[PDB]
Amino acid sequence: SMIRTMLQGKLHRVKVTHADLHYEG
Amino acid sequence: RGSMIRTMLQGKLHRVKVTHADLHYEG
Amino acid sequence: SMIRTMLQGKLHRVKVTHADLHYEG
Amino acid sequence: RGSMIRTMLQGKLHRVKVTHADLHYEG
Amino acid sequence: XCAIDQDFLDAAGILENEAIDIWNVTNGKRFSTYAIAAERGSRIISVNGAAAHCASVGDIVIIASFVTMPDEEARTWRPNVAYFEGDNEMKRTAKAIPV
Amino acid sequence: XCAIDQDFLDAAGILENEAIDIWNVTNGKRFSTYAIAAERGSRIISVNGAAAHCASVGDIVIIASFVTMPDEEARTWRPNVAYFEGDNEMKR
Amino acid sequence: XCAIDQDFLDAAGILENEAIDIWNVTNGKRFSTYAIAAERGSRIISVNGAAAHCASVGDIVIIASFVTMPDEEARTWRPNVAYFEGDNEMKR
Amino acid sequence: XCAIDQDFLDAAGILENEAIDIWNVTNGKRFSTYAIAAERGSRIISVNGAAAHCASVGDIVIIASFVTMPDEEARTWRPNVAYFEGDNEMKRTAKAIPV
């Protein structure tokens, strides 16, 4: 009955392309 | 059984404004 | 099948009585 | 069914020393 | 803790005593606490206890709750989203809202 | 880790080795650790290990634990809350 | 929120509306948000809302998601990893 | 990520790819990442990627993993604890260890 938290997946070393503080959605 | 379980956004309040702050709250 | 994370309990406004950076246990 | 589920310390490494740091790791 | 108008909790599907994340758009602080129901129609958002160090009156915040579910449900799951403007006026869609 | 008078754990339903959140009313810091039992009646709240960087003796804190359960049960769930004042005196 | 090219979500097994951790290699900040799909092929990684305080355009980040499962299955579990370089070019 | 000698993972019951919390006794930083297995007997503890901003060679850390279980099991559950000293020399009990 012992439930583990495991890495499901990752994006390794992607670059941020945009930042939008005022985003609505 | 043994199914993989995801953590998913249930819901949100988007861009609500804070109306009060109470550091000393008893509750 | 939708599982919620809920406050189980709390100690409200307790005071720290001791700090022990070097604790072994 | 509907049982209340706790988050519990499974195990720990207590006061292990860091031996290496690699900011640029590819893995 | 964060006290929230019960009408807002209903719209976002958030329960009293549920864990919530609060992301402060104004100051960038991020913190996790739990929800407390405030009177329906009060339009209250009140940051209580230690959380009062993380937000101030007038700050714009996003309040989120997360649930767990199996992958297949997750793949078709639709979050409950409520959008605000003005005097904590709630709308169903983002298309209503000023800059 | 945080060692806590077992009387207090009993009142709040917090278990030894359970994950706990600590929210520091004094200094604003927020961190997550696990509960250790301290002697019953001692009124101890001890921050140990790295957590000693997040709280000082005399700081006022809120110590919480969380559980999961299905939505149907969550709707009527009632948390175990213990209130304190003065020198960790429970019931007000 | 973080909007991410759907191609990238597909490779990493990350779902729209899933909780994600973002670890900023450039500046050290660490935060948790949720994934939004961006147009397939766009190579977008957009930090939105309050998360715009935690990352700047050009910062290098690691974006991860976590799942739970019983210990017996966890022992052989294999994560979905996608590697990138240059201008979000996948496969190296 | 944090690469950890497989012998240490076995002693603490931590799985490769498991979520871990790292609490830095030296500098007070606290962060969550995942475990990567390093070669058995290497005695490696390596902080990789963004985590390298949170710990440095020589820092003393506590590495914890958490699991979920029903209340009744939780009430009798015994964590797997490994204690260290010196050159990442592992012991079963705290009673061995210098100041």
d(CA G24, CA G29): 5
From the list E22, E63, F18, the residue with the least C-alpha distance to C10 is F18
Q: Which residue from C minimizes the CA distance to D4?
A: C8
Annotated resolution, angstroms: 1.5
Mind telling me the catalytic residues of H? 1, 34
Structure tokens at G53: 């305080």
d(CA E36, CA E18): 8
d(CA H88, CA D18): 9
From chain C, the residues in CB contact with H86 under 8 A are none
| Sign of the alpha-carbon torsion through F32, F33, F38, F40 | positive
Task: Transcribe H4-54 into DSSP letters.
Answer: EEHHHHHHHTPPTTBEEEEEETTT--EEEEEEEEEPTT---EEEEGGGGGT
Tell me how far apart the terminal alpha carbons of chain E are, to the nearest angstrom.
Answer: 30
Question: Taking a C-beta distance cutoff of 8 angstroms, is the pair A20, G31 a contact?
Answer: no
From chain E, the residues in CB contact with F27 under 8 A are 53
d(CA G49, CA G66): 22
State the catalytic residue, choosing from G19, G31, G34, G36.
G34
From chain E, the residues in CB contact with A24 under 8 A are 83, 94, 97
**Which of C6, C10, C24 is the best mutation test for F, with the most CBs of F within 10 A?**
C10
Chains interfacing with A (3 or more CB pairs < 8 Å): B, D, E, G, H
From chain C, the residues in CB contact with F49 under 8 A are 20-21, 23
Q: What is the CA radius of gyration of chain H?
A: 14
CATH 3.40.50.1370, applies to E2-99: no
Question: Taking a C-beta distance cutoff of 8 angstroms, is the pair G10, G90 a contact?
Answer: no
Q: Chain C: give the shortest CA distance to residue E87, in Å.
A: 29
Structure tokens at H56: 């440095």
d(CA F38, CA H4): 31
Q: Chain B: give the shortest CA distance to residue G20, in Å.
A: 9
From the list F24, F34, F27, the residue with the least C-alpha distance to F65 is F34
Cβ contact D–B (≥3 pairs, < 8 Å): no
Q: Is E51 annotated as a binding residue?
A: yes
Q: How many residues does chain B have?
A: 27
Question: Taking a C-beta distance cutoff of 8 angstroms, is the pair A6, H19 a contact?
Answer: yes
| Chains B–E, number of C-beta pairs less than 8 Å apart | 142
Q: Chain B: give the shortest CA distance to residue A7, in Å.
A: 11
| Domain ranges within chain E, ordered by starting residue | 2-99
The domain F2-92 is placed in CATH, from the list 1.10.599.10, 2.60.40.420, 3.20.20.140, 2.40.40.20, at: 2.40.40.20
Burial readout E73-91 (b: 16 or more C-beta within 10 A, e: otherwise)? bbeebebebbbbbeebebe
Please indicate if any CB of chain A lies within 8 Å of the CB of B20. no
Structure tokens at D7: 């988050």
d(CA F56, CA F22): 13
How far does CA H86 lie from the centroid of its chain? 16
